[PDB]
Amino acid sequence: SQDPMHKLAIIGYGAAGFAAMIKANELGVKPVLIGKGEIGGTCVNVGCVPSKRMLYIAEIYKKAREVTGSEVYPPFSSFQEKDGLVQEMRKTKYEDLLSYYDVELIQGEARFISPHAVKVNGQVIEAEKFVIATGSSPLIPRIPGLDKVGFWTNREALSPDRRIDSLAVIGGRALALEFAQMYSRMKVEVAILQRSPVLIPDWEPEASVEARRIMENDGVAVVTGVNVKEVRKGAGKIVITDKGEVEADEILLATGRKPNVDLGLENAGVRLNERGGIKVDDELRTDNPHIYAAGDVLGGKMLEALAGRQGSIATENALTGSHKRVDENAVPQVIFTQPNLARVGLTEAEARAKEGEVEARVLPMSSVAKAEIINSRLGFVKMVTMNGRIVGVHAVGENVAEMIGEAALAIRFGATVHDLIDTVHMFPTIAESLRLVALAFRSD
Amino acid sequence: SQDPMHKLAIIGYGAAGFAAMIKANELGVKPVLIGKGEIGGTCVNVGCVPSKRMLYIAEIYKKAREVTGSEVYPPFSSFQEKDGLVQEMRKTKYEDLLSYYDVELIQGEARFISPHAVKVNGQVIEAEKFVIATGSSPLIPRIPGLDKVGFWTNREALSPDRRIDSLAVIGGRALALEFAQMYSRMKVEVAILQRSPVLIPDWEPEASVEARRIMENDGVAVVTGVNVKEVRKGAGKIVITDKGEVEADEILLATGRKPNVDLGLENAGVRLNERGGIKVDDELRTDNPHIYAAGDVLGGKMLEALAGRQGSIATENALTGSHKRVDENAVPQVIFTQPNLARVGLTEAEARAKEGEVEARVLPMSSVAKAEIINSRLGFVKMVTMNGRIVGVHAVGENVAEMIGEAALAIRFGATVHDLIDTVHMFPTIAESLRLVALAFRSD
Ligand SMILES: Cc1cc2nc3c(=O)[nH]c(=O)nc-3n(C[C@H](O)[C@H](O)[C@H](O)COP(=O)(O)OP(=O)(O)OC[C@H]3O[C@@H](n4cnc5c(N)ncnc54)[C@H](O)[C@@H]3O)c2cc1C
Ligand SMILES: Cc1cc2nc3c(=O)[nH]c(=O)nc-3n(C[C@H](O)[C@H](O)[C@H](O)COP(=O)(O)OP(=O)(O)OC[C@H]3O[C@@H](n4cnc5c(N)ncnc54)[C@H](O)[C@@H]3O)c2cc1C
């Protein structure tokens, strides 16, 4: 028999799929790239780019109100203005690359029909190797009355159909925090309804404390330990919980994301992991050794830079036979509230659960000169070492997102606290808090 | 003979001298610490702390005017308000340490009278070892009429005696840029008069370009290639130059700093270097092997974090017999205008002047997603490698001061561009510009 096949097919054209496409070109292969929906996927269109833009607008108006005492809020039109930036970035960063790089693009929904083939738009596409990069979708909880009453997800909260006065946010991790701060800074009365007893319960305890303070400082009502029983429609929307009824103009779901795995995977011998994403080994290879997967479809951390890195590594492993990995314990995550929350590596509890000598220190941000100078004293920097190497850094403070890459690099290099002590920082910066917390390991 | 002496005397109680005092305590020695003037020296009192505070105030009001369209400038009282922060920081960071650590403090002017002794307040103080950390003072150029007409230095520009409408700044390096932006953002008409053909002429060429644009964007008149011949008094102060007369309410000298070396050094066998600072080897030891020196008195880079590090290293080398050094080519410098200018390591020209394979790349800030998102597209990131190791990073952009410590750490570790490529950053941050410029080494 002979069965000529493409060398590589990539399923999905978001951050992971683009990274795969680029890598494939670099290794001398013209891939087939199959996607549906807006080019560039979640990040550029309904994710990191429009969300950070609206938080920037929120921030500059908040500062303007503090300085002037005026009640100036961002105009409702600022949501529509941001659509110009999205369009420009989608063009320059994604659409223009489809002209520059070599690729057979197909727009449509792919589903596996064999271990070496998909169907799309009724046609068979066969490939020697696949990279699955189909992303995630909003997770819609099963709550009586919710579908009938209707709700917003991120998509709608970024392009709102109307001006609202009140918002009930269901959920209490990063996206809830970001949208709650965003809408509260637009003169919307926001409540967060969180099931766990604290916000961001998989972060350091100190971070969960600060998360509450950040929200409350902008007038958000934070309700923790709550179970939502039902939703109904009154004058506005009524969320009925075991701690009372919360009425609001609109409901925003921020209860997580579900990997996009409705792909006929059983036809290709690909399995799901316990988190509902594609099951892969550390080299991003599935149970079918010709199929790799990358990005949010893995059901792991959901980050643009990690999705990109995984799309590159999956592609190289598929086309070269390499055995490359991307160490998730040096990958940073940031919540882009003001002040920022940032983390990379292990929490102290995670480190203490492994074998090894663990130390940890926490430096208050109120001790950092620059934080005093710019009136941003809320926060902290926490550093965790295992056998004398830095393995985790967690921080809350002004623009800590800008210093977390120093911490990531320190962790990749296995830097010790003396290594940081020996590195002259710039005074006065927020970043020199990394060296000040290192000094805390022996010094006061 | 017997001549009992103290183990260590430290001359000057700024950043270097404090660092020495602390280090001495850590090695089990109670030093004698001799200083004059305000405790904490330049940084806290008339340097980095009050200057960054006033630039912060300038910045938040500028943003408030952009957002509201109102003509709100910082009140003249904000200079006096900053004196509270200075006092608080002087107490917590310096005066309180004199109670916590063990030290014999003497306030007065020290001068050497022998290789092992100083005089202060008419008393002989003998020590086995000395660390000289006497700082620098403003450099006052010899210009006819200038002393009679009078001028401001940093001290006066930070605590102005009156409200002015116009300012002539003599000089064109970091402090000129910072004060020019500061006063222009206080509705003062500022002119910079610079002798060299460009601003900051020891920075990368790209930085000098950007420096001019930054100044001009706030309405500063930048005059380069000018020689100041004379000053006279008219209605206001008249600076006569070979390119015309510039009249202003006040004159600010920003023409550099002179090390404080009027110390009787010839009595102790200590010599001066070609830049007018104390001559030392890389271990901070002078020609008298019992005398070390640290900080701005060396006539090298003038930075708080470097002065601290040198005071620690000088002390350890003096008391333990070690041979430690502080590598100046991993020490960062930042100009805290908005946007910031930052640098660490070698310029491209400096690297190309040494033997080795040199590469360099420049990434525009307009290519960085976060810079687009926050409307701060002016700038660049330049990376220089020598034999495949990163040896210099230079950047202009919003809050680049916060990412320059990542670059410093990369340089200390001898990181390659692949090392940066392999480190997942956070999207969207300004800091991921370090990885984007690394990608430029092979990729477009
Ligand atoms: C509101 C919001 C804000 C965020 N902010 C940040 C942030 O600040 N920083 C950060 O790092 N991360 C952020 N994220 C997460 C980040 O956007 C994602 O982790 C990232 O987009 C992952 O990209 P991906 O390619 O793995 O998934 P996607 O980009 O969703 O890739 C899937 C793409 O493939 C196509 N596709 C899907 N299924 C199929 C199929 N069956 N057949 C054919 N084609 C298909 C779709 O068209 C889709 O565009 C945010 C997410 C959200 C929702
Ligand atoms: C306006 C301005 C802004 C600045 N901003 C920054 C910045 O943002 N970041 C940064 O890194 N750097 C900055 N600097 C530079 C920084 O302040 C100095 O490099 C730093 O203070 C050096 O400290 P030092 O201890 O070496 O000198 P000093 O702190 O001046 O130490 C000298 C001290 O010793 C005492 N002394 C001096 N001579 C004698 C003597 N003969 N006998 C006895 N005692 C003596 C004096 O009382 C003096 O306080 C700035 C400088 C200025 C002027």
Residue numbers in the entry:
A (entry chain A), B (entry chain A): -3 to 440
From the primary publication:
In these environments, biology utilizes a finely tuned protein catalyst termed the mercuric reductase (MerA) (encoded by the merA gene) in order to reduce toxic ionic mercury (Hg2+) to the far less toxic, volatile, and elemental form (Hg0). The reaction catalyzed by MerA follows the reaction scheme of NADPH + Hg2+ → NADP+ + Hg0. Structural characterization confirmed that MerA is a member of the DSOR protein family, which adopts a βαββαβ fold, and which is known to catalyze pyridine-dependent substrate reduction with a characteristic active site CXXXXC motif. Here, we report biochemical and structural characterization of a thermostable MerA from the aerobic thermoacidophilic Crenarchaeon Mse (MseMerA).
The crystal structure of MseMerA was solved to 1.6 Å, with R and Rfree values of 16.9 and 19.6%, respectively. Bound FAD was observed, suggesting that these molecules act to stabilize the structure. No mercury was observed in the active site. As expected based on the sequence alignment, a clear reduction in loop regions was observed in comparison to Tn501MerA. No electron density for the carboxy terminus of MseMerA was identified from 440 to 448, including the conserved pair of cysteines at residues 446 and 447. This is in agreement with the carboxy terminus being able to undergo conformational changes during the catalytic cycle. The structure of MseMerA reveals a dimeric biological assembly, as has been shown with previous structures. With this architecture, the active site cleft on one monomer interacts with the C-terminal domain of the opposing monomer. In contrast, in MseMerA, the F441′ in the position of tyrosine in Tn501MerA lacks a hydroxyl group to coordinate the Hg2+ ion, but a glutamic acid in place of the Tn501MerA V317 provides a different residue with which the Hg2+ ion could potentially be coordinated. Retention of 100% activity after incubation at 97°C for 100 min further confirms the highly thermostable nature of MseMerA.
